[PDB]
């Protein structure tokens, strides 16, 4: 077990932090975040350094560290 805190930043500049393990499938984070915004998880896309976070990605796989940022955008097409 090894935990890290990630900062999730939404379209309106709000932030929610998540404490997760390096091995945590990031679907859990996506679901929780969408839940707290009251929108369906599949209306959102979650990006790390601009790349899409897959349900089965982990922080270790993406090379995330303590206090890294995840951005949340509306799912495309919309700009």
């Amino acid at each position: 077990g090894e935990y890290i805190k990630l900062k999730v930043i939404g379209q309106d500049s709000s932030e929610i932090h998540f404490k997760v393990k390096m091995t945590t499938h990031l679907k859990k984070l996506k679901e929780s975040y969408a839940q707290r915004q009251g929108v369906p998880m599949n209306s959102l896309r979650f990006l790390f350094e601009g790349q899409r976070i897959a349900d089965n990605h982990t922080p270790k796989e993406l090379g995330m560290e303590e206090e890294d940022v995840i951005e949340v955008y509306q799912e495309q097409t919309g700009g």
Binding site: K5, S14, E15, I16, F18, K19, K21
Partner: peptide
């Protein structure tokens, strides 16, 4: 300013 929000994800 929003308060700090930390959610711990179990495993």
């Amino acid at each position: 300013e929003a308060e700090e929000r930390i959610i711990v994800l179990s495993d």
